Design an enzyme around this catalytic site. Sequence first.
Site, mmCIF file in Angstrom:
data_model
loop_
_atom_site.group_PDB
_atom_site.id
_atom_site.type_symbol
_atom_site.label_atom_id
_atom_site.label_comp_id
_atom_site.label_asym_id
_atom_site.label_seq_id
_atom_site.Cartn_x
_atom_site.Cartn_y
_atom_site.Cartn_z
ATOM 1 N N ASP A 32 0.048 14.502 -3.936
ATOM 2 C CA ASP A 32 0.108 13.057 -2.637
ATOM 3 C C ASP A 32 -1.663 12.207 -3.075
ATOM 4 O O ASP A 32 -2.007 12.606 -2.463
ATOM 5 C CB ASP A 32 0.449 12.651 -1.764
ATOM 6 N N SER A 35 -3.011 10.724 0.050
ATOM 7 C CA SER A 35 -3.335 11.159 1.184
ATOM 8 C C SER A 35 -4.570 12.297 0.720
ATOM 9 O O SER A 35 -4.252 12.856 -0.475
ATOM 10 C CB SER A 35 -2.620 11.517 2.475
ATOM 11 N N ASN A 37 -3.974 15.487 3.501
ATOM 12 C CA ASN A 37 -3.890 16.949 3.775
ATOM 13 C C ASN A 37 -3.392 17.636 3.173
ATOM 14 O O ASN A 37 -2.431 16.711 2.549
ATOM 15 C CB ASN A 37 -3.636 16.353 5.395
ATOM 16 N N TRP A 39 -0.263 20.378 3.803
ATOM 17 C CA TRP A 39 0.650 20.625 5.272
ATOM 18 C C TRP A 39 1.949 21.295 4.928
ATOM 19 O O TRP A 39 2.185 20.722 3.982
ATOM 20 C CB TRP A 39 0.659 20.450 6.567
ATOM 21 N N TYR A 75 2.196 9.119 8.385
ATOM 22 C CA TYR A 75 2.247 8.472 6.989
ATOM 23 C C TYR A 75 3.017 6.573 7.179
ATOM 24 O O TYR A 75 3.149 6.169 7.641
ATOM 25 C CB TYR A 75 3.324 9.378 6.139
ATOM 26 N N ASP A 215 -0.984 5.622 -6.011
ATOM 27 C CA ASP A 215 -0.627 6.205 -5.171
ATOM 28 C C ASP A 215 0.651 7.199 -5.825
ATOM 29 O O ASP A 215 1.643 6.970 -6.005
ATOM 30 C CB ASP A 215 -0.199 5.708 -3.717
ATOM 31 N N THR A 218 4.088 6.953 -3.496
ATOM 32 C CA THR A 218 5.167 5.786 -3.105
ATOM 33 C C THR A 218 5.861 5.815 -5.016
ATOM 34 O O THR A 218 4.955 5.578 -6.621
ATOM 35 C CB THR A 218 3.719 4.351 -2.801
HETATM 36 C C1 LIG Z 1 5.075 11.393 0.477
HETATM 37 C C2 LIG Z 1 4.624 10.552 1.865
HETATM 38 C C3 LIG Z 1 3.013 10.945 1.867
HETATM 39 C C4 LIG Z 1 4.736 9.001 1.308
HETATM 40 N N1 LIG Z 1 4.165 8.251 1.216
HETATM 41 C C5 LIG Z 1 2.959 7.318 0.322
HETATM 42 C C6 LIG Z 1 1.278 8.169 0.456
HETATM 43 O O1 LIG Z 1 0.637 8.653 0.239
HETATM 44 C C7 LIG Z 1 1.085 7.180 1.748
HETATM 45 C C8 LIG Z 1 0.231 5.438 1.042
HETATM 46 C C9 LIG Z 1 0.136 4.874 2.497
HETATM 47 C C10 LIG Z 1 -1.087 4.561 2.507
HETATM 48 C C11 LIG Z 1 -1.768 3.851 3.653
HETATM 49 C C12 LIG Z 1 -1.173 3.225 4.045
HETATM 50 C C13 LIG Z 1 0.481 3.605 3.704
HETATM 51 C C14 LIG Z 1 0.800 4.359 3.545
HETATM 52 N N2 LIG Z 1 -0.461 7.864 2.444
HETATM 53 C C15 LIG Z 1 -0.357 7.720 3.979
HETATM 54 O O2 LIG Z 1 0.290 7.084 4.426
HETATM 55 O O3 LIG Z 1 -2.016 8.344 3.888
HETATM 56 C C16 LIG Z 1 -2.142 8.508 5.596
HETATM 57 C C17 LIG Z 1 -2.960 9.851 6.064
HETATM 58 C C18 LIG Z 1 -4.038 9.041 5.657
HETATM 59 O O4 LIG Z 1 -4.021 7.258 5.509
HETATM 60 C C19 LIG Z 1 -2.121 7.081 5.957
HETATM 61 S S1 LIG Z 1 4.489 6.545 2.475
HETATM 62 O O5 LIG Z 1 3.996 5.617 2.323
HETATM 63 O O6 LIG Z 1 4.950 7.137 3.835
HETATM 64 C C20 LIG Z 1 6.032 6.526 1.899
HETATM 65 C C21 LIG Z 1 6.867 7.085 2.063
HETATM 66 C C22 LIG Z 1 8.641 7.491 1.434
HETATM 67 C C23 LIG Z 1 8.962 6.195 1.172
HETATM 68 N N3 LIG Z 1 10.297 5.853 0.267
HETATM 69 C C24 LIG Z 1 7.620 5.748 0.418
HETATM 70 C C25 LIG Z 1 6.108 5.552 0.778
#
Ligand SMILES: CC(C)CN(C[C@@H](O)[C@H](Cc1ccccc1)NC(=O)O[C@H]1CCOC1)S(=O)(=O)c1ccc(N)cc1
Length: 323
Positions: A32, A35, A37, A39, A75, A215, A218
Amino acid sequence: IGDEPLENYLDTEYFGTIGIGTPAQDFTVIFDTGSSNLWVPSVYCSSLACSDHNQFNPDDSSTFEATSQELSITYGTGSMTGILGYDTVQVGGISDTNQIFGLSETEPGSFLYYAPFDGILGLAYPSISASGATPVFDNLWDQGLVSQDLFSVYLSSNDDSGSVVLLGGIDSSYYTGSLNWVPVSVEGYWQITLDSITMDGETIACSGGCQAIVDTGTSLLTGPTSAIANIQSDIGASENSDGEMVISCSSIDSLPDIVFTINGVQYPLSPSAYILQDCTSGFEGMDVPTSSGELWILGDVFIRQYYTVFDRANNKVGLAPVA
Ligand SMILES: CC(C)CN(C[C@@H](O)[C@H](Cc1ccccc1)NC(=O)O[C@H]1CCOC1)S(=O)(=O)c1ccc(N)cc1
């Protein structure tokens, strides 16, 4: 140089296997770039999502070292809490010793329950890592386990095999043309400045510039809901009774490219890329407010078309069309 194969799950999620502990306990993790981390679920977690995924057992690892540091991450969809620990992580053929990572204690929500992957391996900057946990790639570089402080990502199309994260290397068999380099605008995510989004020579969004992140985690290409609304109308997509952004498959052969200008260079997406077919829109409205402004997310819809290099040595993103 390390090669981490990724499974292409329905052109929606790209995850690979890692081993944690001695002997190794295996997990699938999303690689990813949005992000930072690492885990995985652990035996300390009773959440439903933990019950239906592999759970790390520190008791069975002779190299585990406990800490008293807690962890919490939210997330876009999904969240976790847990405790940090140290162990050896096998990733891309590399023995990543002394790697701090999260052992989940809660993983609420349906998304993580139905997701095929166990955990997340973030590939972004330390400044967005929860609890300041050292990201995997930072630990690799710190220990001299890669000679070049960069990694590249090839994401396959049509549910094909062959996706990879290449740790410490760039492989020109995955692209054509020359890599173009984009300066990271804000070190945190792999954040860059988009100059414009055009279609048939007309600006349709991001007039005067916008902020975006590259990303792998995504699936879709997301932007502020207002701008995305215009784009959906521009391509002829309309919401269903079921909330699906439906589009006529006929338009894949008639619509023009949508062009993203990044650092002055044009990156087209053909309708074959931004229309998903099995037809729906590859664009999704999602508002991501930050100090820099609302973020667009160039997700897998975009990355599938451009081999991407993530260069921590000079804080740049390289792009070239996939082979
Ligand atoms: C495997 C997960 C991580 C998937 N996500 C992608 C990640 O890259 C996600 C992208 C993002 C960045 C900033 C704001 C909002 C989203 N990073 C993320 O939230 O980082 C956190 C910790 C640091 O800052 C915020 S998702 O956006 O949750 C997601 C979930 C489900 C679907 N169908 C599509 C997307």
